[PDB]
Amino acid sequence: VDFTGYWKMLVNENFEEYLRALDVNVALRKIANLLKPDKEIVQDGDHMIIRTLSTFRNYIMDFQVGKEFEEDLTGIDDRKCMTTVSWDGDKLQCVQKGEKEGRGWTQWIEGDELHLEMRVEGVVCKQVFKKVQHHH
Ligand SMILES: C[C@@H](c1cccs1)N(C)Cc1nc(C(c2ccccc2)c2ccccc2)no1
């Protein structure tokens, strides 16, 4: 599996409850639900760069698969986590150790679709992106 590409958001399901489970305030929650970020991903061996891009915020993950790293989430839910992204078959599994229980996400590909499931304290958000070729 190779996630390299430019991806455009198609659906964003149960995002508001996921943010509510992170204790994001109502007003910020309302702003975040209106965002439809693109994803620019470069998979370079075990080195992974995931750029989540929007006018409101560019969130950059730059990590080595299998290596724990300190993830700065202050601009999101005002927290930090010790995060580990690992391979699980053809799926990418992320565990975010921190204050919130069961926090993490799973990423995988189906055809021309990038699938992203985010989780925290039983709440599941599901996002699907489409691979695109017009670069901005
Ligand atoms: C970005 C996301 C992931 C990146 C790679 C796997 S998940 N993560 C940080 C949690 C998350 N923030 C968001 C979303 C967001 C922004 C502000 C507050 C709460 C959520 C967002 C972040 C950045 C750009 C545009 C919208 N929606 O989800």
Residue numbers in the entry: 2 to 137
Please share excerpts from the published article on this structure.
Cellular retinol-binding protein 1 (CRBP1) is the primary transporter of all-trans-retinol (atROL) in the eye, and its inhibition has recently been shown to protect mouse retinas from light-induced retinal damage. We determine binding affinities for the newly identified compounds and elucidate mechanisms of their interaction with the protein by solving high-resolution X-ray structures of human CRBP1 in complex with selected inhibitors. Consistent with the fluorescence data, all of the crystallized compounds acted as competitive inhibitors of CRBP1, occupying the same binding site as atROL. Apart from specific hydrogen bonds, effective binding of retinoids or other high-affinity ligands to CRBPs requires interactions with the entry portal region of the protein, comprising α-helix I and II, as well as hairpin turns between β-strands 3–4 and 5–6.
As anticipated, the substitution of the hydrophobic 4-methylphenyl cyclopentyl group in inhibitor 1 with diphenylmethyl moieties yielded a functional CRBP1 inhibitor, denoted as compound number 5. For example, compounds that contain the 1,2,4-oxadiazole ring form a hydrogen bond between their nitrogen atom N(2) and an ordered water molecule, whose spatial position is further stabilized by the interaction with the side chain of Q128 (inhibitors 1, 3, 5, and 6). A secondary interaction site is formed between the nitrogen atom of the N-methyl group and the ordered water molecule (inhibitor 1, 5, and 6), which in turn is involved in an extended network of hydrogen bonding with the side chains of residues Y19, W106, and R104. The spatial position of these compounds reveals an overlap between the orientation of the β-ionone ring of atROL and the methylphenyl or cyclopentyl rings (inhibitors 1, 2, and 6), diphenylmethyl rings (inhibitors 3 and 5), or the tetrahydronaphthalene moiety of inhibitor 4. The stability of the main chain in the α-helices I/II and the loop between β-strands 5 and 6 correlates with the binding affinity of the tested compounds, showing a notable reduction for ligands with lower binding affinities. It is noteworthy that inhibitor 2, 3, and 5 exhibit a greater propensity to stabilize the α-helices I/II region in comparison to compounds 1, 4, and 6. Additionally, it is interesting to note that certain nonretinoid ligands have the potential to enhance conformational flexibility in segments of CRBP1 that remain well-structured even in the protein’s apo form. This phenomenon is particularly observed in inhibitors 2, 3, and 5, where their binding leads to a partial destabilization of β-strands 6 and 7. Interestingly, the magnitude of changes in conformational flexibility depends on the type of inhibitor. abn-CBD and inhibitors 2, 3, and 5 exhibited the strongest stabilizing effect on the portal region, followed by inhibitors 1, 4, and 6.
